[PDB]
Amino acid sequence: AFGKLHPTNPEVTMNISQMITYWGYPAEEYEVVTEDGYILGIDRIPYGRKNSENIGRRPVAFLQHGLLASATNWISNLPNNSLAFILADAGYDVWLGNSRGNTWARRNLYYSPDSVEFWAFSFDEMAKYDLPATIDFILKKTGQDKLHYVGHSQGTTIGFIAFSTNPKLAKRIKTFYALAPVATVKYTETLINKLMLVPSFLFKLIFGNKIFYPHHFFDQFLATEVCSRETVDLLCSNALFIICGFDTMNLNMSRLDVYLSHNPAGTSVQNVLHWSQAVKSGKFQAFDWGSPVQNMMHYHQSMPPYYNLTDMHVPIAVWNGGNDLLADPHDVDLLLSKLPNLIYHRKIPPYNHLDFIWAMDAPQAVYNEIVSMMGTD
């Protein structure tokens, strides 16, 4: 049988602002330019359908997605269960970032997306250039002094790096809301572990030296034709669970077409390679460019420098899942034992890695608590 469970959701083919206006919310596009030339397309929802107060003074909430994802991560479902829309209706001026390399931040001033140099970056550069550039842009635009930073996965990784090496930037973050925080990955539980322990050499032999898993036409075929049909349905949902952990009943099966037609959103092979070094070393450190000389040219050292969570003094609230296979409890716990200004920690036992952005009960489990916390800030 395997018949289409539902007619293709319109969001499947919309870009960020299309989805926002699709739900009746105000959408605004902008693009940041990183010191090193990358052009990042960022989006904003100035007010919500339910709150238009203090226009021009609304507190800023910046949501940063993680590896191979995009800003849609925060507006992937309904207005009542998608963080971005909720923050809007809660009275916030919501900004959604996009990391270099993804669907909407894949353009540089100096290099061609088809050049090797273009994809010669990892989350190091996202922390060092993407964030400063994006946050600086938002605050100069809105006129606010600080903003509320919410990150997910690698979205928190770049936040840890920046806010701990950039004293000036850090001072502009009201509270750091980290969902499925990732500083190290030496205890991840997902099968995709091993693909990360393969020698760098082989990794590049397999994938290449440029783009990594971006959105293809075929991704759309599977998205609209496989993730929408009755039983073949499970191929999509289980591919997601093998990566994030199991919480089968929290995922809206009627929206897999939306999720997979937007994820992955691509990134550099280097970035995934950097994460690979992380899975192997089990440490939290900068990228190894592959030679004392190249690292010299980057760190003035022979070995990339280690990142210190102990120097990340921004008040941080953490939410991690007991069933997350990426931001596993063990790595998260080591991360919590270092953070100097932990203001909050809530471990949601059944939560997996994707729940933080798509769990049908995310509002009650996490979002409402974030709204509450940001409200008394």
Ligand SMILES: CCCCCCCCO[C@@H]1O[C@H](CO)[C@@H](O)[C@H](O)[C@H]1O
């Ligand atoms: C957490 C936000 C989503 C991140 C991107 C998930 C991509 C899901 O897509 C899956 O990716 C797997 C690994 O590449 C593949 O094995 C599967 O074939 C593919 O369907």
Ligand SMILES: *[P@](=O)(CCCCCCCCCCC)OCCCC
């Ligand atoms: P987050 O940004 C997780 C994003 C999920 C993308 C899935 C990629 C699969 C590769 C993982 C292999 C272990 O954290 C990034 C840390 C991943 C190491």
Ligand SMILES: *[C@@H]1O[C@H](CO)[C@@H](O)[C@H](O)[C@H]1NC(C)=O
């Ligand atoms: C999204 O779609 C709208 C309308 O088609 C278009 O104006 C806008 O440029 C698109 N955004 C991006 C970044 O592609």
Ligand SMILES: *[C@@H]1O[C@H](CO)[C@@H](O)[C@H](O)[C@H]1NC(C)=O
């Ligand atoms: C959101 O709206 C859907 C659709 O009616 C509803 O089923 C769900 O329970 C709502 N969730 C929340 C947290 O409001």
Ligand SMILES: *[C@@H]1O[C@H](CO)[C@@H](O)[C@H](O)[C@H]1NC(C)=O
């Ligand atoms: C699941 O997604 C479908 C399609 O968008 C929607 O009609 C339904 O209300 C959603 N259910 C929940 C619990 O959000």
Ligand SMILES: *[C@@H]1O[C@H](CO)[C@@H](O)[C@H](O)[C@H]1NC(C)=O
């Ligand atoms: C972490 O602290 C050590 C202490 O000397 C320092 O050498 C290192 O550079 C710090 N990490 C960064 C990159 O700030």
